[model samples]
Target: VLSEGEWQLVLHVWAKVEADVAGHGQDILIRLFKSHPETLEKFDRFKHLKTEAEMKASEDLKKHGVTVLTALGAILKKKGHHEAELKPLAQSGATKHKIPIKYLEFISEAIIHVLHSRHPGDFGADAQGAMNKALELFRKDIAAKYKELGYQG
Candidate 1:
């Protein structure tokens, strides 16, 4: 079993990340980590170490949110903010619903595009075309997933 401390860290990280992503944008991770380098360290696995990182290909809103939060938690655990993080998380979740899928897809694509371009040699001109088509597919997929889950206004 995971330690109580570890579990708490996960929840703490998730809450901070969700609120931030929902409020700012995914690119906010870069800025958040600039001030808080702890959050950036654990993320090296996905950010740099993964060899076959077809990160762009499988990217989607929920997965992106969860991954970013997990990275945040891993870093926060190394620090000592578990107690402080819980209060905001509990108070916030009671009120905030999942972001609407439209914004989710829009933000996810924007972040992924930013991430892709920040790298020096990840893509060619042909890759840009592929990105457009891939993102178009992802948008349709998110819309369908939202409706399929019986979400209604």
Candidate 2:
């Protein structure tokens, strides 16, 4: 659970990026793909995007990015009690694809990187720390579902 102060800082920072969820989300996905290109192969809709320019220009990529961030937005509204809402989403991915569980960690890192780059002033140490903790919970919840679904790696 996030402390009162942490929740306040996270919500404050999140509000700033909420205005352009697609932009931020797509950037986050791009950052993840740059760091771990293999993860991009897991996305059937985006696997054909061979270049950064192609990825940036893909409407499908943008739509999926928006979907990812919208899910995060709902999770944020739950304020950390996200297992019920998050489990099904995780299970769906696990059941449909052989995604490595470590991708969750990579995505979490990408999220932080995007937020920090976009709002360095507002996403200070305290806010970053709070966001990290929140994302850790998200990772754990998704990992649990992946494990239950017998996904290895």
Candidate 3:
């Protein structure tokens, strides 16, 4: 749960993030893959993209990146009262893909890294902290779903 000030800080930065979901999303994914190459194994469509150029040029990666950011945008719109809405979305992705929660953790790190890198002025320490808490909640929700569904690893 986020404090009122924290929620406001998150929403303030989120406004910019929502403006170019595709671009930001793609950058986050690129950062994720670059920092943690093993995570690429989870994406069938993008696993073949061996280089940054290849990943950037792949329409499949772009589409998936957009999808991911769209989902996050929807969740962020709910502010602090997002668990009900987030649960189903997180659970569906978790069960369908059988993704490890660690990958979600990695994605969270990538998101914060991208936000801070892109908006150093706006995404300051407080905003980054808020976003980190928000993403942790998302990760917990997904982890819970994975456990509920009896997913191994």
Candidate 4:
């Protein structure tokens, strides 16, 4: 389903979360947000949740320079994204928080599995492909848009 690059971007997120990150991942997410402004609109941000988890995990993820989950909430819609996030948590056997702070870094179609009505497999495949394709096409688009906006990459 994933075309190739989009899946990579999702991986790019997780990759950032890998072992010893000493960079400011928020800067990366911020760049990603700026590049894919649309994703900000599409992403789910869990409201009602204090977002304090980011702080707690920051210490754990600090070595890797973890991205801040709360910042993502500024653009993403909480109620919508949470269901998508729940599956992996369930998979990980984590049953504590209302939202998983880590997923902001990588939210693939896997999140769809946790959906209330269960997104279809093909749909997930299609979405993964769609997200991949979207990101792929978007990279080019963002580049061009940025160029037009008087910014050079």
lDDT agreement of model 2 with the native: 0.84
Candidate 2 weakest lDDT stretch, 10 residues: 92-101
lDDT of 4 at 46: 19
lDDT of 3 by residue, 39-111 (tens): 8877777776888888888888888899888888778767756667777765666667666778888888999
Taking the tens digit of each residue's C-alpha lDDT, what string does model 2 give over 1-153?
789888778888889878898899889999999998888877777877888888889889988899888888788768888878888787777887666557778898999999999999999888999998888877777777888878754
In candidate 1, list every pair of residues with a backbone clash: none
lDDT of 4: 0.35
Q: For model 1, how does the per-residue alpha-carbon lDDT over 28-146 read when each residue is reduced to its tens digit?
A: 44443444444444343445422222332324423555564454344345333333443343232223443344443444455445435453254435444444444444344434444
TM-score of 4: 0.25
Off by over 4 Å in 3: none
Worst lDDT run of 10 residues, candidate 4, spans: 71-80
Candidate 2: give the clashing pairs: none
Question: Against the true structure, whose TM-score is highest?
Answer: 2
Q: Cα-based RMSD of the predictions, in order?
A: 17.0, 1.6, 1.7, 16.3
TM-score of each: 0.35, 0.91, 0.90, 0.25
Higher-lDDT candidate among 1 and 2?
2
Q: What is the lDDT of residue 35 in candidate 3?
A: 92
The best-first sequence of candidates by TM-score reads 2, 3, 1, 4
